[PDB]
Amino acid sequence: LQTPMQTVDDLRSVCDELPHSLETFPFDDETLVFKVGYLSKSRMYALTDITQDPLRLSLKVDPERGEELRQAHPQSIAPGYHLNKKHWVTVTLDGTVPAELLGELLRGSYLLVTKKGFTKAERKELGLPDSLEGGSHH
């Protein structure tokens, strides 16, 4: 099922299922970074500072959709914190944005990165998928 998308454990649970995903802490702080790709070439798709409660989740979004999201949830979705605000938003994980939407945005950020950061040949070699399974049924 849908986790509540409110803890690091919730985020791990989603990212652990995504092919070639890797956790690191490349800063000096407690910023957990999820990257996708080869061990010699991996690209960030989600970040959160694990010492903050509630967590803040940064992720990549199509610019148009980021604009919509920020208008639909202005108190909970901000331009990406210390990130390229053309492509990143930061979502407060306090229960104010539906878990199912959050899950999909997290999977979406991963997909976008595989599309933008890797070529068709790369995605074939490594085996990065065109779409993701384990969408929930309605």
The rounded distance, in Å, linking the Cα atoms of 28 and 135 is 35
The rounded distance, in Å, linking the Cα atoms of 111 and 118 is 11
The rounded distance, in Å, linking the Cα atoms of 106 and 102 is 6
Q: Determination method here?
A: X-ray
75, two tokens: 């108190």
Closest by Cα among 50, 45, 26, 18 to 34: 45
Half-sphere exposure of 41 (CA within 13 A, CB side): 8
Separation of first and last alpha carbons in the chain: 12
Q: Is 4 helix (H, G, I), strand (E, B) or coil?
A: coil
- Contact (CB, 8 A) for 91 and 48: no
- Contact (CB, 8 A) for 36 and 43: yes
Question: What structural domains does the chain harbor?
Answer: 1-138 (3.90.1150.30)
Query: What is the CA 137 to chain-centroid distance, rounded?
Result: 21
The rounded distance, in Å, linking the Cα atoms of 40 and 106 is 23
The rounded distance, in Å, linking the Cα atoms of 72 and 112 is 21
The rounded distance, in Å, linking the Cα atoms of 95 and 25 is 25
Give the DSSP letter string of 28-49.
SSSEEEEEEEETTEEEEEEEEE
Q: Is 132 helix (H, G, I), strand (E, B) or coil?
A: coil
The amino acid present at 104, given as its one-letter code, is E
